[PDB]
Design a protein around this nucleic acid. Structure first.
Ligand SMILES: [Rb+]
Ligand SMILES: [Rb+]
Lengths: 66, 66
DNA sequence: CATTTAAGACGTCTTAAATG
DNA sequence: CATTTAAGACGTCTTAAATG
């Protein structure tokens, strides 16, 4: 059921920051955040690692849940 | 500095496996492993994580090293 | 034989416009 | 306004051929 992009957005909403603010922490645009959250694309390896740090969770959690 | 792909190859050689056998463990072709090792491309998010498990090191070690 | 090169399909980013 | 859509450049894969 649950997609990675849904967990990315839940974790960003928990921080209460905008897509642009998260993009800035990660080193990508607000649009890349948006594409990830909507499961349009998935983050590449370097961006997944930066995202999981900004989000304070592990890459595995983002990728596969729990 | 040392590139991620040289770290991938050094770790694979430690394990004494061919690129095809690593590929099998990760879920990609031997060519993808060749591409990564030669820094032609970098693994995407899901592949980087699968690669790090198959190699028993962390995603951060692969991407950034010590 | 193991690995690299090549070509090409599809994925992951970018900025600007549109939407709500 | 924040976000999503659009258009488009370069990135990541696959198989087949070439290389050694
Ligand atoms: Rb408007
Ligand atoms: Rb408007």
């Amino acid at each position: 059921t649950q997609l990675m992009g849904e967990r990315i957005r839940a974790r960003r909403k928990k921080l209460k920051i905008r897509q642009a603010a998260l993009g800035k922490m990660v080193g990508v645009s607000n649009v890349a955040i948006s594409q990830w959250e909507r499961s349009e694309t998935e983050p590449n390896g370097e961006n997944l690692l930066a995202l999981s740090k900004a989000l304070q969770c592990s890459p595995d959690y983002l990728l596969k849940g729990d």
